[PDB]
Enzyme design. Sequence first.
Site, PDB file in Angstrom:
ATOM      1  N   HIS A 127     -11.509 -13.856   1.172  1.00 34.15           N
ATOM      2  CA  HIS A 127     -10.446 -14.137   0.221  1.00 34.15           C
ATOM      3  C   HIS A 127      -9.675 -15.229   0.952  1.00 34.15           C
ATOM      4  CE1 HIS A 127      -8.055 -13.518  -3.230  1.00 34.15           C
ATOM      5  NE2 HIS A 127      -7.007 -13.821  -2.484  1.00 34.15           N
ATOM      6  N   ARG A 130       5.017 -15.528 -13.098  1.00 35.62           N
ATOM      7  CA  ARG A 130       3.581 -15.403 -13.282  1.00 35.62           C
ATOM      8  C   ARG A 130       3.069 -15.787 -14.657  1.00 35.62           C
ATOM      9  NH1 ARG A 130       0.971 -15.105  -8.552  1.00 35.62           N
ATOM     10  NH2 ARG A 130       1.079 -17.109  -9.697  1.00 35.62           N
ATOM     11  N   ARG A 156       5.939 -24.244 -10.389  1.00 37.11           N
ATOM     12  CA  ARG A 156       5.638 -24.532  -8.987  1.00 37.11           C
ATOM     13  C   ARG A 156       6.023 -25.984  -8.628  1.00 37.11           C
ATOM     14  NH1 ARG A 156       2.190 -20.931  -5.801  1.00 37.11           N
ATOM     15  NH2 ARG A 156       1.732 -19.671  -7.637  1.00 37.11           N
ATOM     16  N   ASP A 164      -8.462  -9.572  -4.420  1.00 35.98           N
ATOM     17  CA  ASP A 164      -7.341  -9.872  -5.330  1.00 35.98           C
ATOM     18  C   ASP A 164      -7.596  -9.112  -6.657  1.00 35.98           C
ATOM     19  OD1 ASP A 164      -5.628 -11.563  -3.866  1.00 35.98           O
ATOM     20  OD2 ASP A 164      -5.652 -13.188  -5.311  1.00 35.98           O
ATOM     21  N   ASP A 177     -10.872 -12.331  -7.572  1.00 37.65           N
ATOM     22  CA  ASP A 177      -9.593 -12.480  -8.254  1.00 37.65           C
ATOM     23  C   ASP A 177      -9.595 -11.837  -9.628  1.00 37.65           C
ATOM     24  OD1 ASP A 177     -10.087 -14.761  -6.216  1.00 37.65           O
ATOM     25  OD2 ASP A 177      -7.891 -14.503  -6.374  1.00 37.65           O
ATOM     26  N   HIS A 183      -7.640  -9.414 -10.674  1.00 36.92           N
ATOM     27  CA  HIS A 183      -6.255  -9.308 -11.093  1.00 36.92           C
ATOM     28  C   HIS A 183      -5.991  -8.416 -12.326  1.00 36.92           C
ATOM     29  CE1 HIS A 183      -4.604 -11.788  -7.974  1.00 36.92           C
ATOM     30  NE2 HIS A 183      -5.488 -12.743  -8.209  1.00 36.92           N
ATOM     31  N   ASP A 199       0.388  -6.239  -2.390  1.00 34.31           N
ATOM     32  CA  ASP A 199       1.489  -6.346  -3.353  1.00 34.31           C
ATOM     33  C   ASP A 199       2.224  -5.001  -3.446  1.00 34.31           C
ATOM     34  OD1 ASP A 199       0.911  -8.927  -3.932  1.00 34.31           O
ATOM     35  OD2 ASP A 199       0.430  -8.644  -6.053  1.00 34.31           O
ATOM     36  N   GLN A 235      -9.160 -19.363  -6.674  1.00 36.68           N
ATOM     37  CA  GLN A 235      -9.459 -19.152  -8.092  1.00 36.68           C
ATOM     38  C   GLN A 235     -10.077 -20.369  -8.766  1.00 36.68           C
ATOM     39  OE1 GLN A 235      -5.999 -15.576  -8.406  1.00 36.68           O
ATOM     40  NE2 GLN A 235      -6.515 -16.783 -10.256  1.00 36.68           N
ATOM     41  N   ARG A 273       2.182 -21.847 -13.716  1.00 35.59           N
ATOM     42  CA  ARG A 273       2.293 -22.251 -12.321  1.00 35.59           C
ATOM     43  C   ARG A 273       2.465 -23.770 -12.172  1.00 35.59           C
ATOM     44  NH1 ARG A 273      -1.647 -22.196  -7.066  1.00 35.59           N
ATOM     45  NH2 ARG A 273      -1.891 -19.920  -6.906  1.00 35.59           N
ATOM     46  N   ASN A 275      -5.127 -10.999  -0.517  1.00 34.42           N
ATOM     47  CA  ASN A 275      -3.694 -10.889  -0.229  1.00 34.42           C
ATOM     48  C   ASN A 275      -2.940 -10.029  -1.236  1.00 34.42           C
ATOM     49  OD1 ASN A 275      -4.417 -13.358  -1.764  1.00 34.42           O
ATOM     50  ND2 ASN A 275      -2.174 -13.638  -1.897  1.00 34.42           N
ATOM     51  N   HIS A 276      -3.299 -10.115  -2.518  1.00 32.52           N
ATOM     52  CA  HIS A 276      -2.586  -9.278  -3.474  1.00 32.52           C
ATOM     53  C   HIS A 276      -2.857  -7.797  -3.302  1.00 32.52           C
ATOM     54  CE1 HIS A 276      -0.410 -12.168  -5.842  1.00 32.52           C
ATOM     55  NE2 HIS A 276      -1.373 -12.986  -5.440  1.00 32.52           N
ATOM     56  N   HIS A 297      -9.513 -16.374  -3.994  1.00 29.72           N
ATOM     57  CA  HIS A 297      -8.134 -16.796  -3.684  1.00 29.72           C
ATOM     58  C   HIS A 297      -7.703 -18.083  -4.344  1.00 29.72           C
ATOM     59  CE1 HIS A 297      -4.389 -16.862  -1.453  1.00 29.72           C
ATOM     60  NE2 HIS A 297      -4.749 -17.802  -0.588  1.00 29.72           N
TER      61      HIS A 297
HETATM   62  N1  LIG Z   1       5.168  -9.147  -3.242  1.00 29.88           N
HETATM   63  C1  LIG Z   1       5.595 -10.267  -3.827  1.00 29.88           C
HETATM   64  N2  LIG Z   1       6.791 -10.246  -4.451  1.00 29.88           N
HETATM   65  C2  LIG Z   1       7.228 -11.363  -5.036  1.00 29.88           C
HETATM   66  N3  LIG Z   1       6.649 -12.554  -5.117  1.00 29.88           N
HETATM   67  C3  LIG Z   1       5.464 -12.542  -4.490  1.00 29.88           C
HETATM   68  C4  LIG Z   1       4.880 -11.474  -3.834  1.00 29.88           C
HETATM   69  N4  LIG Z   1       3.669 -11.847  -3.272  1.00 29.88           N
HETATM   70  C5  LIG Z   1       3.545 -13.107  -3.612  1.00 29.88           C
HETATM   71  N5  LIG Z   1       4.596 -13.590  -4.352  1.00 29.88           N
HETATM   72  C6  LIG Z   1       4.797 -14.932  -4.891  1.00 29.88           C
HETATM   73  O1  LIG Z   1       3.525 -15.485  -5.188  1.00 29.88           O
HETATM   74  C7  LIG Z   1       3.328 -16.703  -4.416  1.00 29.88           C
HETATM   75  C8  LIG Z   1       1.861 -16.823  -4.068  1.00 29.88           C
HETATM   76  O2  LIG Z   1       1.079 -16.865  -5.253  1.00 29.88           O
HETATM   77  C9  LIG Z   1       4.273 -16.535  -3.233  1.00 29.88           C
HETATM   78  O3  LIG Z   1       4.600 -17.791  -2.635  1.00 29.88           O
HETATM   79  C10 LIG Z   1       5.482 -15.870  -3.888  1.00 29.88           C
HETATM   80  O4  LIG Z   1       6.277 -16.824  -4.561  1.00 29.88           O
HETATM   81 MN   LIG Z   2      -5.810 -14.431  -6.852  1.00 27.13          MN
HETATM   82 MN   LIG Z   3      -5.116 -14.511  -3.293  1.00 25.91          MN
END
Ligand SMILES: Nc1ncnc2c1ncn2[C@@H]1O[C@H](CO)[C@@H](O)[C@H]1O
Ligand SMILES: [Mn+2]
Ligand SMILES: [Mn+2]
Length: 525
Positions: A192, A385, A354, A59, A16, A18, A95, A229, A350, A91-92, A227
């Site tokens: 991840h 974020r 969240r 990530d 992660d 980032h 993006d 983190q 978050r 997963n990121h 993931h």
């Molecule tokens: N490509 C993206 N565009 C916008 N929001 C995203 C994207 N990928 C993840 N997220 C947001 O980040 C959250 C996961 O950390 C998702 O539930 C969503 O709210």
């Molecule tokens: Mn991450």
């Molecule tokens: Mn992740």
Amino acid sequence: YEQDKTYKITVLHTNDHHGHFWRNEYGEYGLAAQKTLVDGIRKEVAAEGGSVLLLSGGDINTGVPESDLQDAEPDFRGMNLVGYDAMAIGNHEFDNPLTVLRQQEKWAKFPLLSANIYQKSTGERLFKPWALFKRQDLKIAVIGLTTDDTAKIGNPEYFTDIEFRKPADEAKLVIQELQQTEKPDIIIAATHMGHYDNGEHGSNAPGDVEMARALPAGSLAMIVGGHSQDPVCMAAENKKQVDYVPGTPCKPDQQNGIWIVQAHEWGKYVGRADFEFRNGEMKMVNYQLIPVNLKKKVTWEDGKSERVLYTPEIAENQQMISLLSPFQNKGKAQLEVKIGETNGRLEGDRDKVRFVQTNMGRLILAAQMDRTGADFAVMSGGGIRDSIEAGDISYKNVLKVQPFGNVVVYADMTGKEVIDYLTAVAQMKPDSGAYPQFANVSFVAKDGKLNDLKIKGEPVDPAKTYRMATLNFNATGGDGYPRLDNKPGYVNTGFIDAEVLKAYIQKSSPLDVSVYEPKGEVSWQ
Ligand SMILES: Nc1ncnc2c1ncn2[C@@H]1O[C@H](CO)[C@@H](O)[C@H]1O
Ligand SMILES: [Mn+2]
Ligand SMILES: [Mn+2]
């Protein structure tokens, strides 16, 4: 292997990242410092006759404007210089469009791995499932796995022909294949997927613990994760320490004979697992998380406070600095231009966005309705974020809060569709990125129904239509939100979230935080 011979293997790991290729404002972490720490460990390990394996839990993408604006090129190149041996696709890494990920693989001199991502149309893997390493008389295989929550929580459009099969299930297959064909002495999984105390993943896709428990005993020497983190340092069996303190002992998790580690986030630590192998037994002789120039706050009675390193300062490798400098400075003046100022802190953490409504949410949404002539607004809390503090605001500040590059869009719907849509969205609870953030809306939602529903302060007139503003992400079904892109009144303006937000704050400055303070119009119960 050689009978009775002891082999030394050191596994280093981070996850992660980032976009944190550069040290932070307080001189913390960064890849230049990471470079020094790792070169140093390589020398000690080599002098003892062991070998080093450096792995990433993924990530790498998204999280620092200078990195984001450049598709993490500085990050991946820095990783080449640090000398990473392999990485688990995170997963990121989705993006950006796939071509971006493919360019990152061209940049990376180490493989980006994932065994469980498949192209739907072909049933074939989009990435290599593992990399092999021959060290002395041993053969080490590293498998990569990616959380199957990737498409579920990511941008819908990227995954139309991509499927993330269950990581645990793929792990069973890959390991068996390896044992049958490659016969590695040691298998490590870089993943991840997330570490959840006692496998209590809740709403999240199952992660490392559940997988370790489902695989054959000792079938993996260890799982190098990410993931979630977290610094994976156990306080008790199946319970991670809360508030782990940099510099203190870190006891990694162990499940079904398989170690599980994680080095928190952003280059804050380099985990170091020291193993000895002899006649088949794999012994972890030491494990620690090495802080990369992390600092704590010390406060003097005179009230002054200062930042002090937990451990001896680690010098920044200059070759790394030379490599990263251009990326760090590309367009610095622009990013740091004052664009406005805020009365106070705009809650964007978050833990908040969240779980509860916040002013950053009101702000971003205000920016979005204003630009769209919308009556009401909503976005995923998982879209916020970062928070913004009292004082001047720079564009960089904004790219930090909204880094995904989402597009602002609106929908003109009948009061009918409105109620139905809001009722649906309200169905997603806290502790989820899909959590909703509202503006100019209110209700006393209960038992899945929307009691006392209103827009701005006036109930919803079925006959009358309204314009709602949001992101394309949500509009296309991200976080499973009701698809708006394929229905009646829907419009994509093409305006980037950050830009709309910048503009809105430039013209609305000075910002008066009190104007954006939620008062409970949204409540549920
Ligand atoms: N490509 C993206 N565009 C916008 N929001 C995203 C994207 N990928 C993840 N997220 C947001 O980040 C959250 C996961 O950390 C998702 O539930 C969503 O709210
Ligand atoms: Mn991450
Ligand atoms: Mn992740």
